[PDB]
């Protein structure tokens, strides 16, 4: 009874869609729209609630970066505003550790953040923690073994192959081995002891390559590439498989959803989104 939710995104303008995909039967459900359109946001889940964090509304009337945190309850199909972050964060990355949401990086106009802040749902409060060693927008974030990783991105001048890890009990960030490819706008997730980085943009092309970091060995290794090159894709893990959703391939706003099986090292097309889009926020929780 778990669905893949996709929130927001962009196609002509930033979007307010909330749609949920059921891998068990291939269906899509359109649910309550976000109150404000946004692309470049991130999604996450804590205690059965879905959260939409940051992003920017790129509308016909202008660009507004978002510091918003909005809460969706599948039991009522209703969005509720939660406490806003200290600063707007477009092209943010988020990770959940021990019931708390970490918001990492992102931009506010020409400001590229290294700052990081943590949300406690029990108090509806954000607090700043140690900043990253590098400013990162279009950064991929994932959590493995209660450690937070920030991968790739763009620092205001260069696209990055670097990555770093936050150790919460020391409130400290440390660099990890850099990836073998420069990636800004990649999808980053965790699956079976590894941090995966899929797609993104290297400065010249949108990528179909995928590499994974084994935290025990400190190495990055390429796996099978996706069928579609994509940047600003959504990504999540569900029942031991990675799912990538949409993105931009330099020509089209993809509706493709591919699924990676780690046992066979293969990607397959599993469904199409209802319309092509980039910059979505994705997470997995109960059916509404």
């Amino acid at each position: 009874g778990r669905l893949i939710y996709t929130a927001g995104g962009y196609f002509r303008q930033s979007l307010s869609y909330l749609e949920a995909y059921n891998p068990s039967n291939g269906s899509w459900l359109r649910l309550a729209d976000l109150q404000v359109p946004r692309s470049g946001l991130a999604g996450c889940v804590v205690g059965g609630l879905l959260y939409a964090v940051g992003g920017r509304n790129n509308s016909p009337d202008g660009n507004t970066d978002s510091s918003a945190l909005d809460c969706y309850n599948p039991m009522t199909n209703q969005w509720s505003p939660c406490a806003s972050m200290s600063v707007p964060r477009n092209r943010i990355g988020v990770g959940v550790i021990d019931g708390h949401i970490y918001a990492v990086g992102g931009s506010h106009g020409c400001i590229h953040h290294s700052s990081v802040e943590r949300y406690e749902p029990e108090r509806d409060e954000w607090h700043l923690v140690a900043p990253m060693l590098t400013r990162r927008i279009g950064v991929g974030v994932a959590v493995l073994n209660r450690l937070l990783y920030a991968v790739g991105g763009f620092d205001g001048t260069n696209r990055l192959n670097s990555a770093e890890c936050y150790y919460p009990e020391r409130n400290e960030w440390r660099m990890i081995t850099p990836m073998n490819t420069i990636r800004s706008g990649a999808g980053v997730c965790v699956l079976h002891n590894c941090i995966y980085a899929a797609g993104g943009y290297d400065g010249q092309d949108q990528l179909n390559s995928v590499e994974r970091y084994d935290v025990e060995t400190e190495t990055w290794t390429f796996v099978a590439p996706m069928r579609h090159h994509r940047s600003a894709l959504g990504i999540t893990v569900h029942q031991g498989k990675i799912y990538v959703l949409g993105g931009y391939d330099g020509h089209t706003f993809l509706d493709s959803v591919e699924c990676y099986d780690p046992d066979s090292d293969t990607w397959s097309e599993v469904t199409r989104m209802t319309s092509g889009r980039s910059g979505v926020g994705v997470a997995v929780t109960m059916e509404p």
Binding site: Y10, N58, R91, G138, F154, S184, Q206, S231, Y248
Partner: peptide, 9 residues
């Protein structure tokens, strides 16, 4: 357009 996202500008 932004080559990373496809968005206008």
């Amino acid at each position: 357009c932004d080559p990373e996202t496809g968005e206008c500008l």
